[PDB]
Structure 1
Amino acid sequence: DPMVSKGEELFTGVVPILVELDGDVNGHKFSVSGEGEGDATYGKLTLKFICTTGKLPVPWPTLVTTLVLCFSRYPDHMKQHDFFKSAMPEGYVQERTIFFKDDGNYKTRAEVKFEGDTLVNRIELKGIDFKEDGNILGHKLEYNYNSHNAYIMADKQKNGIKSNFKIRHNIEDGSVQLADHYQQNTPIGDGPVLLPDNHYLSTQSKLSKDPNEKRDHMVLLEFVTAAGITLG
Protein backbone atom coordinates (compact mmCIF):
# COMPACT_ATOMS: atom_id res chain seq x y z
CA ASP A 1 0.00 0.00 0.00
CA PRO A 2 1.66 3.29 -1.06
CA MET A 3 -0.18 5.01 1.80
CA VAL A 4 1.53 2.60 4.22
CA SER A 5 4.89 2.82 2.44
CA LYS A 6 4.78 6.63 2.70
CA GLY A 7 4.97 6.39 6.48
CA GLU A 8 7.46 3.52 6.40
CA GLU A 9 9.80 5.56 4.22
CA LEU A 10 9.42 8.68 6.34
CA PHE A 11 10.24 6.79 9.54
CA THR A 12 12.91 4.41 8.25
CA GLY A 13 16.04 4.58 10.33
CA VAL A 14 16.66 7.11 13.05
CA VAL A 15 14.70 10.37 12.68
CA PRO A 16 15.72 13.54 14.57
CA ILE A 17 13.05 15.04 16.83
CA LEU A 18 12.57 18.61 18.04
CA VAL A 19 10.02 19.46 20.74
CA GLU A 20 9.10 23.04 21.66
CA LEU A 21 6.52 23.91 24.31
CA ASP A 22 5.23 27.21 25.68
CA GLY A 23 3.18 26.89 28.85
CA ASP A 24 1.20 28.89 31.36
CA VAL A 25 0.00 27.08 34.49
CA ASN A 26 -1.87 29.28 37.00
CA GLY A 27 0.07 32.25 35.59
CA HIS A 28 3.46 30.52 35.85
CA LYS A 29 4.94 30.99 32.37
CA PHE A 30 7.53 28.49 31.21
CA SER A 31 9.10 27.00 28.11
CA VAL A 32 10.55 23.58 27.33
CA SER A 33 12.89 22.62 24.49
CA GLY A 34 13.55 18.99 23.59
CA GLU A 35 15.93 17.25 21.24
CA GLY A 36 16.42 13.61 20.43
CA GLU A 37 15.69 10.87 17.97
CA GLY A 38 13.06 8.27 17.18
CA ASP A 39 13.30 4.77 15.73
CA ALA A 40 9.74 3.77 14.83
CA THR A 41 10.86 0.29 13.76
CA TYR A 42 11.31 -0.40 17.50
CA GLY A 43 8.62 1.99 18.73
CA LYS A 44 11.43 3.88 20.41
CA LEU A 45 12.32 7.44 21.16
CA THR A 46 15.01 9.10 23.21
CA LEU A 47 14.61 12.75 24.15
CA LYS A 48 16.24 15.26 26.45
CA PHE A 49 14.09 18.19 27.54
CA ILE A 50 15.30 21.55 28.89
CA CYS A 51 13.27 24.05 30.85
CA THR A 52 14.65 27.16 29.15
CA THR A 53 12.93 29.60 31.53
CA GLY A 54 14.52 28.34 34.74
CA LYS A 55 12.84 25.91 37.12
CA LEU A 56 9.88 24.02 35.71
CA PRO A 57 6.81 25.10 37.73
CA VAL A 58 5.12 21.68 37.40
CA PRO A 59 6.59 18.16 37.82
CA TRP A 60 8.35 16.74 34.78
CA PRO A 61 6.34 13.47 34.81
CA THR A 62 3.14 15.45 34.30
CA LEU A 63 4.46 16.63 30.90
CA VAL A 64 5.54 13.26 29.46
CA THR A 65 2.37 12.64 27.43
CA THR A 66 2.33 16.24 26.17
CA LEU A 67 5.99 16.38 25.11
CA VAL A 68 4.95 11.99 19.10
CA LEU A 69 2.87 8.87 18.50
CA CYS A 70 4.04 8.60 14.89
CA PHE A 71 7.05 6.81 16.40
CA SER A 72 4.85 3.98 17.69
CA ARG A 73 5.60 0.51 16.37
CA TYR A 74 2.66 -0.82 14.38
CA PRO A 75 3.21 -4.53 13.63
CA ASP A 76 2.70 -5.83 10.11
CA HIS A 77 -0.90 -6.93 10.82
CA MET A 78 -1.71 -3.46 12.21
CA LYS A 79 -0.11 -1.10 9.68
CA GLN A 80 -3.49 -0.25 8.12
CA HIS A 81 -4.41 1.33 11.49
CA ASP A 82 -1.46 3.76 11.77
CA PHE A 83 -3.21 7.12 11.50
CA PHE A 84 -0.19 8.93 12.93
CA LYS A 85 2.30 8.11 10.18
CA SER A 86 -0.37 8.32 7.49
CA ALA A 87 -0.91 12.02 8.24
CA MET A 88 2.77 12.76 7.53
CA PRO A 89 4.61 14.80 6.37
CA GLU A 90 1.85 17.43 6.54
CA GLY A 91 1.23 16.25 10.09
CA TYR A 92 -1.59 16.36 12.60
CA VAL A 93 -2.95 18.41 15.46
CA GLN A 94 -2.89 16.65 18.82
CA GLU A 95 -5.16 18.23 21.42
CA ARG A 96 -5.74 17.16 25.01
CA THR A 97 -7.43 18.04 28.23
CA ILE A 98 -5.69 16.39 31.19
CA PHE A 99 -7.76 16.41 34.38
CA PHE A 100 -5.69 16.02 37.55
CA LYS A 101 -7.94 14.46 40.19
CA ASP A 102 -8.68 16.91 43.03
CA ASP A 103 -6.59 19.53 41.21
CA GLY A 104 -6.43 21.54 37.99
CA ASN A 105 -6.35 20.65 34.31
CA TYR A 106 -3.97 21.07 31.40
CA LYS A 107 -5.32 22.04 27.99
CA THR A 108 -2.82 21.35 25.22
CA ARG A 109 -2.66 21.95 21.48
CA ALA A 110 0.25 20.62 19.45
CA GLU A 111 1.22 20.32 15.80
CA VAL A 112 3.28 17.28 14.88
CA LYS A 113 4.80 17.47 11.40
CA PHE A 114 8.02 17.23 9.45
CA GLU A 115 10.21 20.29 8.98
CA GLY A 116 12.75 19.00 6.52
CA ASP A 117 14.13 15.71 7.79
CA THR A 118 13.18 16.52 11.40
CA LEU A 119 9.97 15.50 13.14
CA VAL A 120 8.70 18.48 15.12
CA ASN A 121 6.26 18.66 18.04
CA ARG A 122 5.21 22.30 18.68
CA ILE A 123 3.00 22.67 21.76
CA GLU A 124 0.97 25.28 23.63
CA LEU A 125 -0.17 24.37 27.13
CA LYS A 126 -2.49 26.21 29.52
CA GLY A 127 -3.11 24.93 33.05
CA ILE A 128 -5.91 26.30 35.24
CA ASP A 129 -7.68 25.67 38.54
CA PHE A 130 -4.53 24.29 40.16
CA LYS A 131 -3.82 24.45 43.86
CA GLU A 132 -0.72 26.63 44.23
CA ASP A 133 0.51 24.29 46.98
CA GLY A 134 -1.04 20.99 45.75
CA ASN A 135 0.72 17.92 44.35
CA ILE A 136 1.47 19.58 41.01
CA LEU A 137 2.47 23.18 41.73
CA GLY A 138 3.90 21.95 45.07
CA HIS A 139 6.17 19.37 43.35
CA LYS A 140 4.96 16.33 45.32
CA LEU A 141 5.18 13.80 42.45
CA GLU A 142 7.96 11.22 42.27
CA TYR A 143 10.33 11.39 39.30
CA ASN A 144 9.15 8.16 37.70
CA TYR A 145 6.33 6.95 35.45
CA ASN A 146 4.08 3.89 35.17
CA SER A 147 3.39 1.81 32.05
CA HIS A 148 -0.11 1.96 30.61
CA ASN A 149 -2.35 1.08 27.69
CA ALA A 150 -4.58 3.42 25.71
CA TYR A 151 -7.53 2.68 23.46
CA ILE A 152 -7.44 4.50 20.10
CA MET A 153 -10.79 5.04 18.31
CA ALA A 154 -11.52 6.47 14.93
CA ASP A 155 -13.04 9.95 14.84
CA LYS A 156 -14.66 9.77 11.41
CA GLN A 157 -16.29 13.20 11.71
CA LYS A 158 -12.81 14.73 12.04
CA ASN A 159 -10.97 12.27 9.75
CA GLY A 160 -8.82 11.51 12.77
CA ILE A 161 -8.71 9.66 16.08
CA LYS A 162 -9.71 10.14 19.71
CA SER A 163 -8.51 8.49 22.89
CA ASN A 164 -9.32 8.68 26.59
CA PHE A 165 -6.95 7.05 29.06
CA LYS A 166 -5.66 7.29 32.62
CA ILE A 167 -2.12 8.16 33.75
CA ARG A 168 -1.13 7.37 37.35
CA HIS A 169 1.50 9.59 39.01
CA ASN A 170 3.14 8.42 42.22
CA ILE A 171 2.92 10.96 45.07
CA GLU A 172 5.74 11.32 47.64
CA ASP A 173 3.33 10.33 50.44
CA GLY A 174 2.87 6.91 48.82
CA SER A 175 -0.53 7.64 47.27
CA VAL A 176 -1.34 7.99 43.55
CA GLN A 177 -2.40 11.08 41.57
CA LEU A 178 -4.76 10.31 38.67
CA ALA A 179 -4.41 12.26 35.42
CA ASP A 180 -7.44 11.59 33.20
CA HIS A 181 -6.46 12.21 29.56
CA TYR A 182 -8.87 13.26 26.80
CA GLN A 183 -7.18 13.26 23.42
CA GLN A 184 -8.12 14.06 19.83
CA ASN A 185 -5.95 14.10 16.70
CA THR A 186 -6.90 15.62 13.36
CA PRO A 187 -4.86 15.74 10.14
CA ILE A 188 -3.40 19.08 9.08
CA GLY A 189 -3.86 18.23 5.41
CA ASP A 190 -7.25 17.72 3.76
CA GLY A 191 -6.24 14.50 2.00
CA PRO A 192 -6.81 10.86 2.89
CA VAL A 193 -5.35 9.25 5.99
CA LEU A 194 -5.49 5.79 7.47
CA LEU A 195 -8.63 5.89 9.62
CA PRO A 196 -8.11 3.01 12.08
CA ASP A 197 -10.43 0.57 13.65
CA ASN A 198 -10.35 0.64 17.43
CA HIS A 199 -7.10 -0.69 18.88
CA TYR A 200 -4.66 -0.39 21.79
CA LEU A 201 -1.30 1.29 22.21
CA SER A 202 0.98 -0.04 24.96
CA THR A 203 3.68 2.25 26.32
CA GLN A 204 6.48 2.26 28.89
CA SER A 205 8.60 5.27 29.80
CA LYS A 206 11.81 5.60 31.80
CA LEU A 207 12.76 8.98 33.27
CA SER A 208 16.35 9.83 34.15
CA LYS A 209 18.71 12.74 34.79
CA ASP A 210 21.96 13.82 33.14
CA PRO A 211 24.33 14.26 36.12
CA ASN A 212 26.35 16.82 34.14
CA GLU A 213 23.29 18.94 33.26
CA LYS A 214 22.77 21.88 35.63
CA ARG A 215 19.61 23.09 33.93
CA ASP A 216 16.24 21.74 34.99
CA HIS A 217 15.68 18.86 32.59
CA MET A 218 14.28 15.40 31.88
CA VAL A 219 15.81 12.51 29.92
CA LEU A 220 13.08 10.28 28.50
CA LEU A 221 13.23 6.78 27.02
CA GLU A 222 9.81 5.87 25.68
CA PHE A 223 8.51 2.77 23.87
CA VAL A 224 5.08 2.67 22.24
CA THR A 225 3.67 -0.39 20.46
CA ALA A 226 0.31 -1.03 18.83
CA ALA A 227 -0.62 -4.04 20.95
CA GLY A 228 -3.60 -5.19 18.92
CA ILE A 229 -7.27 -4.73 18.20
CA THR A 230 -8.05 -6.38 21.53
CA LEU A 231 -6.11 -7.06 24.69
CA GLY A 232 -7.38 -10.65 24.63
Structure 2
Amino acid sequence: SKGEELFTGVVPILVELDGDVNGHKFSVSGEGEGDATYGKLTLKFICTTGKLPVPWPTLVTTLGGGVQCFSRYPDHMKQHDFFKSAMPEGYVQERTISFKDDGNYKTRAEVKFEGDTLVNRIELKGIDFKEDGNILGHKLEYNYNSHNVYITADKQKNGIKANFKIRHNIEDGSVQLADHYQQNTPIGDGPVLLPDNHYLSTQSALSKDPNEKRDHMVLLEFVTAAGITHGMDELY
Protein backbone atom coordinates (compact mmCIF):
# COMPACT_ATOMS: atom_id res chain seq x y z
CA SER A 1 0.00 0.00 0.00
CA LYS A 2 0.82 3.74 -0.04
CA GLY A 3 0.74 3.80 3.76
CA GLU A 4 3.54 1.23 4.24
CA GLU A 5 6.07 3.69 2.74
CA LEU A 6 5.80 5.81 5.92
CA PHE A 7 7.19 2.90 7.98
CA THR A 8 10.42 2.02 6.12
CA GLY A 9 12.54 3.67 8.82
CA VAL A 10 12.52 4.77 12.48
CA VAL A 11 9.31 6.66 13.33
CA PRO A 12 8.85 8.68 16.58
CA ILE A 13 5.81 7.71 18.71
CA LEU A 14 3.71 9.66 21.21
CA VAL A 15 1.16 7.92 23.43
CA GLU A 16 -1.40 9.77 25.57
CA LEU A 17 -3.92 7.99 27.78
CA ASP A 18 -6.79 9.48 29.79
CA GLY A 19 -8.29 6.93 32.17
CA ASP A 20 -10.90 6.21 34.85
CA VAL A 21 -11.01 2.84 36.63
CA ASN A 22 -13.64 2.65 39.43
CA GLY A 23 -13.51 6.43 39.95
CA HIS A 24 -9.69 6.53 40.02
CA LYS A 25 -8.68 9.16 37.45
CA PHE A 26 -5.25 8.87 35.84
CA SER A 27 -3.16 9.93 32.85
CA VAL A 28 -0.25 8.21 31.09
CA SER A 29 2.24 9.87 28.73
CA GLY A 30 4.49 7.79 26.51
CA GLU A 31 7.48 8.52 24.30
CA GLY A 32 9.68 6.39 22.09
CA GLU A 33 10.09 4.98 18.60
CA GLY A 34 9.10 2.17 16.30
CA ASP A 35 10.94 0.38 13.50
CA ALA A 36 8.43 -1.77 11.59
CA THR A 37 11.22 -3.36 9.52
CA TYR A 38 12.13 -5.30 12.70
CA GLY A 39 8.67 -5.13 14.32
CA LYS A 40 10.35 -3.27 17.17
CA LEU A 41 8.69 -0.88 19.64
CA THR A 42 10.80 0.95 22.24
CA LEU A 43 8.57 2.99 24.57
CA LYS A 44 8.74 4.65 28.02
CA PHE A 45 5.45 5.45 29.79
CA ILE A 46 5.01 7.79 32.78
CA CYS A 47 1.95 8.20 35.02
CA THR A 48 1.68 12.01 35.10
CA THR A 49 -1.07 12.13 37.77
CA GLY A 50 0.94 10.32 40.46
CA LYS A 51 0.76 6.61 41.29
CA LEU A 52 -0.95 4.34 38.73
CA PRO A 53 -4.16 2.86 40.33
CA VAL A 54 -3.92 -0.31 38.20
CA PRO A 55 -0.89 -2.60 37.55
CA TRP A 56 1.34 -1.57 34.61
CA PRO A 57 1.03 -5.01 32.87
CA THR A 58 -2.76 -4.52 32.46
CA LEU A 59 -2.12 -1.47 30.26
CA VAL A 60 0.49 -2.96 27.87
CA THR A 61 -1.98 -3.97 25.12
CA THR A 62 -3.58 -0.51 25.25
CA LEU A 63 -0.28 1.41 25.38
CA GLY A 64 2.03 -0.71 23.21
CA GLY A 65 -0.54 -2.86 21.41
CA GLY A 66 -2.32 0.34 20.43
CA VAL A 67 0.27 0.97 17.71
CA GLN A 68 0.12 -2.34 15.79
CA CYS A 69 1.13 -0.42 12.65
CA PHE A 70 4.68 -1.22 13.76
CA SER A 71 4.22 -4.96 13.34
CA ARG A 72 6.61 -6.67 10.95
CA TYR A 73 4.62 -8.05 8.07
CA PRO A 74 6.87 -10.41 6.06
CA ASP A 75 7.12 -9.56 2.33
CA HIS A 76 4.84 -12.47 1.29
CA MET A 77 2.18 -11.15 3.72
CA LYS A 78 2.31 -7.39 2.96
CA GLN A 79 -1.08 -7.36 1.20
CA HIS A 80 -2.60 -8.24 4.60
CA ASP A 81 -1.33 -5.16 6.49
CA PHE A 82 -4.46 -3.15 7.35
CA PHE A 83 -2.71 -1.06 10.01
CA LYS A 84 -0.18 0.67 7.74
CA SER A 85 -2.66 1.00 4.84
CA ALA A 86 -4.95 3.31 6.85
CA MET A 87 -2.04 5.72 7.37
CA PRO A 88 -1.51 8.81 7.34
CA GLU A 89 -5.24 9.42 8.11
CA GLY A 90 -5.20 6.58 10.62
CA TYR A 91 -7.61 4.29 12.42
CA VAL A 92 -9.91 4.15 15.44
CA GLN A 93 -9.07 1.16 17.66
CA GLU A 94 -11.66 -0.02 20.19
CA ARG A 95 -11.24 -2.78 22.77
CA THR A 96 -13.20 -4.54 25.49
CA ILE A 97 -10.74 -6.13 27.89
CA SER A 98 -12.53 -8.57 30.20
CA PHE A 99 -10.66 -9.71 33.31
CA LYS A 100 -11.87 -13.14 34.47
CA ASP A 101 -13.82 -12.90 37.75
CA ASP A 102 -13.21 -9.13 37.85
CA GLY A 103 -14.07 -5.94 35.93
CA ASN A 104 -13.48 -4.70 32.39
CA TYR A 105 -11.68 -1.98 30.41
CA LYS A 106 -13.36 -0.30 27.46
CA THR A 107 -10.83 1.57 25.33
CA ARG A 108 -11.14 3.93 22.36
CA ALA A 109 -8.01 5.09 20.60
CA GLU A 110 -7.32 7.27 17.57
CA VAL A 111 -4.03 6.27 15.95
CA LYS A 112 -2.73 8.58 13.21
CA PHE A 113 0.20 10.63 11.95
CA GLU A 114 0.72 14.13 13.33
CA GLY A 115 3.44 15.29 10.98
CA ASP A 116 6.10 12.56 10.86
CA THR A 117 5.15 11.34 14.35
CA LEU A 118 2.77 8.43 14.99
CA VAL A 119 0.29 9.33 17.74
CA ASN A 120 -1.94 7.09 19.89
CA ARG A 121 -4.59 9.11 21.83
CA ILE A 122 -6.47 6.81 24.22
CA GLU A 123 -9.54 7.05 26.48
CA LEU A 124 -9.82 4.14 28.95
CA LYS A 125 -12.89 3.37 31.06
CA GLY A 126 -12.69 0.64 33.70
CA ILE A 127 -15.80 -0.60 35.52
CA ASP A 128 -16.91 -3.26 38.05
CA PHE A 129 -13.50 -3.93 39.55
CA LYS A 130 -13.19 -5.65 42.93
CA GLU A 131 -11.72 -3.49 45.73
CA ASP A 132 -9.10 -6.13 46.59
CA GLY A 133 -9.09 -8.07 43.32
CA ASN A 134 -5.94 -8.84 41.30
CA ILE A 135 -6.12 -5.47 39.55
CA LEU A 136 -7.07 -2.91 42.26
CA GLY A 137 -5.24 -4.92 44.91
CA HIS A 138 -2.03 -4.82 42.79
CA LYS A 139 -1.45 -8.59 42.87
CA LEU A 140 0.01 -8.88 39.37
CA GLU A 141 3.71 -9.48 38.75
CA TYR A 142 5.84 -7.08 36.74
CA ASN A 143 6.33 -9.40 33.76
CA TYR A 144 4.57 -10.55 30.61
CA ASN A 145 3.81 -13.66 28.60
CA SER A 146 4.00 -13.84 24.81
CA HIS A 147 0.70 -14.08 22.91
CA ASN A 148 -0.91 -14.19 19.47
CA VAL A 149 -3.34 -11.50 18.24
CA TYR A 150 -5.81 -13.31 15.93
CA ILE A 151 -7.03 -10.99 13.16
CA THR A 152 -10.09 -11.37 10.90
CA ALA A 153 -11.53 -8.97 8.29
CA ASP A 154 -14.63 -6.84 8.85
CA LYS A 155 -15.60 -5.89 5.27
CA GLN A 156 -18.83 -4.15 6.38
CA LYS A 157 -16.97 -1.53 8.45
CA ASN A 158 -13.99 -1.46 6.02
CA GLY A 159 -11.67 -2.66 8.80
CA ILE A 160 -10.63 -5.55 11.03
CA LYS A 161 -11.54 -7.46 14.19
CA ALA A 162 -9.17 -9.18 16.61
CA ASN A 163 -9.53 -11.73 19.43
CA PHE A 164 -6.87 -12.76 21.94
CA LYS A 165 -6.13 -13.91 25.48
CA ILE A 166 -3.62 -12.27 27.83
CA ARG A 167 -2.32 -14.29 30.76
CA HIS A 168 -1.15 -12.04 33.63
CA ASN A 169 1.02 -13.80 36.25
CA ILE A 170 -0.33 -13.36 39.80
CA GLU A 171 2.14 -13.11 42.74
CA ASP A 172 1.09 -16.50 44.21
CA GLY A 173 1.86 -18.44 41.02
CA SER A 174 -1.68 -18.28 39.60
CA VAL A 175 -2.90 -16.65 36.35
CA GLN A 176 -5.30 -13.72 35.77
CA LEU A 177 -6.97 -14.06 32.37
CA ALA A 178 -7.69 -10.92 30.33
CA ASP A 179 -9.87 -11.62 27.29
CA HIS A 180 -9.43 -9.08 24.48
CA TYR A 181 -11.95 -8.19 21.77
CA GLN A 182 -10.70 -5.60 19.27
CA GLN A 183 -12.23 -3.56 16.41
CA ASN A 184 -10.39 -1.22 14.01
CA THR A 185 -11.97 1.11 11.44
CA PRO A 186 -10.22 3.68 9.16
CA ILE A 187 -10.62 7.44 9.73
CA GLY A 188 -10.04 8.26 6.05
CA ASP A 189 -12.12 7.25 3.01
CA GLY A 190 -9.14 5.94 1.02
CA PRO A 191 -8.65 2.23 0.12
CA VAL A 192 -7.33 -0.05 2.86
CA LEU A 193 -6.11 -3.65 2.84
CA LEU A 194 -8.68 -6.18 4.11
CA PRO A 195 -6.67 -9.19 5.38
CA ASP A 196 -7.22 -12.93 5.36
CA ASN A 197 -7.11 -14.66 8.76
CA HIS A 198 -3.67 -14.33 10.39
CA TYR A 199 -2.00 -13.48 13.70
CA LEU A 200 0.51 -11.12 15.28
CA SER A 201 3.11 -12.94 17.42
CA THR A 202 3.64 -10.42 20.22
CA GLN A 203 6.48 -10.52 22.76
CA SER A 204 6.61 -7.84 25.48
CA ALA A 205 9.47 -7.11 27.90
CA LEU A 206 8.89 -4.79 30.87
CA SER A 207 11.58 -2.96 32.86
CA LYS A 208 12.33 0.14 34.94
CA ASP A 209 14.53 3.17 34.25
CA PRO A 210 17.00 3.28 37.25
CA ASN A 211 17.14 7.10 37.04
CA GLU A 212 13.34 7.60 37.03
CA LYS A 213 11.54 8.49 40.28
CA ARG A 214 8.00 8.79 38.84
CA ASP A 215 5.70 5.73 38.44
CA HIS A 216 6.70 4.38 35.02
CA MET A 217 7.12 1.46 32.60
CA VAL A 218 9.84 0.84 30.02
CA LEU A 219 8.54 -1.40 27.22
CA LEU A 220 10.41 -3.35 24.55
CA GLU A 221 7.90 -5.04 22.25
CA PHE A 222 8.40 -7.29 19.22
CA VAL A 223 5.43 -7.93 16.94
CA THR A 224 5.61 -10.22 13.88
CA ALA A 225 2.79 -11.24 11.53
CA ALA A 226 2.37 -14.95 10.73
CA GLY A 227 -0.26 -17.60 9.98
CA ILE A 228 -0.52 -17.29 6.20
CA THR A 229 0.67 -20.04 3.86
CA HIS A 230 3.42 -19.46 1.30
CA GLY A 231 5.31 -21.47 -1.31
CA MET A 232 8.73 -20.03 -0.37
CA ASP A 233 10.13 -23.40 0.81
CA GLU A 234 9.89 -24.82 -2.74
CA LEU A 235 12.59 -22.33 -3.87
CA TYR A 236 15.14 -24.23 -1.75
TM-score when normalising by structure 2: 0.95
Kindly indicate whether the alpha-carbon contact (under 8 Å) linking 1:200 and 1:230 is maintained by their aligned counterparts in 2: no
CA distance in 1, matches of 2:230, 2:21: 36
Task: Kindly state the Cα deviation for residue 8 of structure 1 after the two structures are TM-superposed.
Answer: 3.0
Kindly indicate whether the alpha-carbon contact (under 8 Å) linking 1:78 and 1:228 is maintained by their aligned counterparts in 2: no
5+ unaligned residues in a row in structure 1: which ranges? Answer: none
Kindly indicate whether the alpha-carbon contact (under 8 Å) linking 1:81 and 1:194 is maintained by their aligned counterparts in 2: yes
- Total equivalences in the alignment: 228
5+ unaligned residues in a row in structure 2: which ranges? Answer: 232-236
Task: Kindly state the Cα deviation for residue 230 of structure 1 after the two structures are TM-superposed.
Answer: 6.2
CA distance in 2, matches of 1:187, 1:88: 9
Kindly indicate whether the alpha-carbon contact (under 8 Å) linking 1:75 and 1:226 is maintained by their aligned counterparts in 2: yes
Task: Kindly state the Cα deviation for residue 12 of structure 1 after the two structures are TM-superposed.
Answer: 1.6
Deviation sequence 1:146-201 (CA, Å, 0-9, x none): 00112100001110000111000000011000000000000001221001111111
Deviation sequence 1:84-117 (CA, Å, 0-9, x none): 0000000000000000000000000000000001
Q: 2:2 aligns with which of 2, 6, 16?
A: 6
Residue in 1 that maps onto 2:234: none
CA distance in 1, matches of 2:207, 2:145: 14
- Identity in percent: 97
SS in 1 for 2:2: helix
Deviation sequence 1:32-75 (CA, Å, 0-9, x none): 00000000000001000000000000000000000100000000
Task: Kindly state the Cα deviation for residue 231 of structure 1 after the two structures are TM-superposed.
Answer: 12
Structure 1 residues 218 and 230, CA gap change in structure 2 (3 angstroms): farther
The CA RMSD measured in Å over matched residues stands at 1.4
TM-score when normalising by structure 1: 0.96
CA distance in 1, matches of 2:23, 2:93: 23
**Are 2:134 and 1:102 equivalent residues in the alignment?**
no
Kindly indicate whether the alpha-carbon contact (under 8 Å) linking 1:16 and 1:118 is maintained by their aligned counterparts in 2: yes
SS in 1 for 2:88: coil
Residue in 2 that maps onto 1:80: 79
